[PDB]
Design a binder for this molecule. Sequence first.
Ligand SMILES: Nc1ncnc2c1ncn2[C@@H]1O[C@H](COP(=O)(O)OP(=O)(O)O)[C@@H](O)[C@H]1O
Ligand SMILES: [Mg+2]
Lengths: 98, 594, 49, 144, 121
Amino acid sequence: LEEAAKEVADEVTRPRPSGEEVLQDIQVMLKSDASPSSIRSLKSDMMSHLVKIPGIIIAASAVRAKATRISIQCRSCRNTLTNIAMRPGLEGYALPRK
Amino acid sequence: TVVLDDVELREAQRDYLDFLDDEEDQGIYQSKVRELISDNQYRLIVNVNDLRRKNEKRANRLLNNAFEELVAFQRALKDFVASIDATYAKQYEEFYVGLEGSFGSKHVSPRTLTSCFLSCVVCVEGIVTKCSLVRPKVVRSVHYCPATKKTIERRYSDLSVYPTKDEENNPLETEYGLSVYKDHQTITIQEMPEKAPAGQLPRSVDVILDDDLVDKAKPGDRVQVVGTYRCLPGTFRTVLIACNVKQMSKDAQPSFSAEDIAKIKKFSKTRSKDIFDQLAKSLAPSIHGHDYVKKAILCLLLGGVERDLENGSHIRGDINILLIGDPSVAKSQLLRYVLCTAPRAIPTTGRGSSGVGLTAAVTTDQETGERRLEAGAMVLADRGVVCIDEFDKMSDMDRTAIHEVMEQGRVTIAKAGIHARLNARCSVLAAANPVYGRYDQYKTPMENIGLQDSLLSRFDLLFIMLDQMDPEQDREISDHVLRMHRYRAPGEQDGDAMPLGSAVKMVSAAFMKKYIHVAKIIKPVLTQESATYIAEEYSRLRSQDSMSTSPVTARTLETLIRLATAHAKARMSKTVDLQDAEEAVELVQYAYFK
Amino acid sequence: VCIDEFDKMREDDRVAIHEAMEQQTISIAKAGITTTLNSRCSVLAAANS
Amino acid sequence: EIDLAKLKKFIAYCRVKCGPRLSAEAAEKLKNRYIIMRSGAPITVRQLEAIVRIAEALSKMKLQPFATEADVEEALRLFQVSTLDAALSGTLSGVSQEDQEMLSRIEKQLKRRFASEHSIIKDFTKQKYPEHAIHKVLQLMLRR
Amino acid sequence: QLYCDRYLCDKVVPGNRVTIMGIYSIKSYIRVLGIQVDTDGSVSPQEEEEFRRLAALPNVYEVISKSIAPSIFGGTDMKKAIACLLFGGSRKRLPDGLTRRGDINLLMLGDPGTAKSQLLK
Ligand SMILES: Nc1ncnc2c1ncn2[C@@H]1O[C@H](COP(=O)(O)OP(=O)(O)O)[C@@H](O)[C@H]1O
Ligand SMILES: [Mg+2]
């Protein structure tokens, strides 16, 4: 859906000014009128399943930066693995074996 | 694996050199480098729009890829300087390029500085809060190996690692002269506190300064810096590398809309004399009485005009008012009005800001054990307003530190081996309940709280409000209070109250805020008539001083001058007026005489 | 907000409750920006001293 | 009598549905009464607003968009019970002309003595002075 | 644990009632994808009629006072004060846009031995 938003946005705004010609990614945020599911009514079944729940926020973190696209270099061999996507979520990283 | 030729870098460097080759054209950049050479500095300034005009493609290339393009640019600049003079180029190992001009999307604020701008040029505008000490950063270290009789070099740049042994473990001695070092300071910027929502969080951005850029900034300065926003080595941390810094004027201007200007000019020309009184009534309409106090508060907002003499004087235009009165009086409500009303204000308690307190303070980082000069609440209020509540509860250190800013408008700190002299020129509205309540009109105003009488001398005005049990007056206040209680919005059915939302004749606060901002731009000067009139009034007040608040002194004279100057702003008069001094005189007489 | 032994607040809490009752808001100052948290809550305090 | 949940449901329902205002007749009744307490005195403008909110709370029970003079009378009755409670609490606490007077007496006696620390405090406490009043006077002289 | 990265992030402050659309996930957290904020506010006819009935009662003040805390011993118009706190005043908006607290705050000083902890509970 995001890629669809990317293309349709581009062609709609195809003649961008100079410098603006570079296309930027789009966050296709979502919403719904469906009834929120109670937080207590949550089980492992809906893992990796879209859920809508109510709530009240107790704490917030600072606006930090997390890496989506990364590239690394083999320190000795110079072998470079470029444009590695890092999965969205609260994960760390993954180093190649060699 | 040795790079031989970069045609892109080759052409890009040539394009800059052609741009710098400003002889067929007006000579603006050729003159600049000539002036730079005479200046003996090594950081040229560049307007981006000139590059756009001469080559839009190159400018877009620069802004989208800041790092490599600048490296080509610095290459061209050094080559161009060497063309004009080789030896002067040989003085410096390198040269630097300062950007300037308009940036459509890349001109942002720390609030709006998104992660998307990484590797792009960005012109971040904001306010400095924290500054680190100047430190010499090593960039290129030369070593000598007596065993091999061989010299070895290393460059760090973006890249324990300090080499000390040859591969054969020969000792290495560092040629300190040949090694390259550069002063390097770090500061932090935040959004301008006036234009920032209370709901959102701080967005602090770290800035790196090097070479001449190091001490071209201090805490509590409104600046815009153009630089290359970059990540850091490792989820990552991100910092901005400065390419050029400039301290914009803190006054700025009320751009807003011409409609606001027309409405202001229309309203001002409607009743210029009554604008002062009308504003006062509409200043704090939720509170009945204390009209003279409202007049003074308006005078505080508009303030005076600083006068600076040949002797380096900085005779302040700011006004400082102290309010004392029993609890359950609208003093606190007055401050809420001023915060909502003032153009550039900031609240604070008797404690002051956490850790830093009222004025600045030195704080170790505790994440790396690194000293940081943190601006305080007072410093951020420079050329603005500060509202202090529970002013009696000020700490003794702050009770001393307030003296300097009240007198000189600048706070100094040499402690922790850290030297700084910050600007804190800020009209201050302080308030404090009397101790144990129950003010007595027999002791000094100091004795009811305790201020040493230096602060009372420093404050331009002191107003005392007492909880008099007059049935008529209490009826007037209470009837006003209940009228506010009974008041309901035109659109409502007397039913439910306002929703509990997550978000947070009489003129509007915003329009008033716009007008005082416009009035603050106005610079009313003195009139010989009013100067003669006020001088007689002061001498009259000296004659009144025979009778036995503080006695009239030269402090009171200058206080009246600022008050007339403030009223001169209130009517937008380009000069002071007898009305201005006359309003100030009665105001002062009301303050010292009940 | 039911508060048993309201006298035994923390000192920072004692600072915070001032604005809270006076404004129904908790203000946290981080340098210049001072974020605000709405607390339009009634309070039932209890104490002994 | 009413269920715990039912009371909660009523409380939420009336709150979200009704924020009562003050009727003009009830308002002037309170106004004259407020002046009487001031002349009799203590009552403050903060207490006036607190009484107003209590009256709104009372009328919100009956869901009246306006608060009656009887509703004001109910609030003043409860407030005056709190005011009598406040008088004895101020007697307990010592927080006030008499408090001002004894603090001045404490200041004068201390100046007579001087111008251990525990012994001084205990002797002042044994002279029919509160410890909090002694501590307050100590803080003030340090500030002064 | 909620995880908002792009423009969805930084749209909220702690304490707000909101409704999130996201993905249940475990490392146990949410990959949030959409947010709705209760920027204002958040009833069967029978409940309405009951509350209309109850408010119309002449001794609704007295019954509410007595009915709330019969379990506790030693209550006389403290129950009334607890009620009025629960009902609360009107969060008035002043003509010039300022606001006054709609709440009422009560203090129960005196004997900790008395079972007011039950009353708070
Ligand atoms: N002249 C007045 N007109 C209207 N309200 C007043 C007046 N004097 C006091 N008040 C009331 O006092 C309350 C605020 O008191 P506050 O300023 O916090 O006390 P202090 O500043 O002495 O600590 C407001 O609710 C306001 O209604
Ligand atoms: Mg106050």
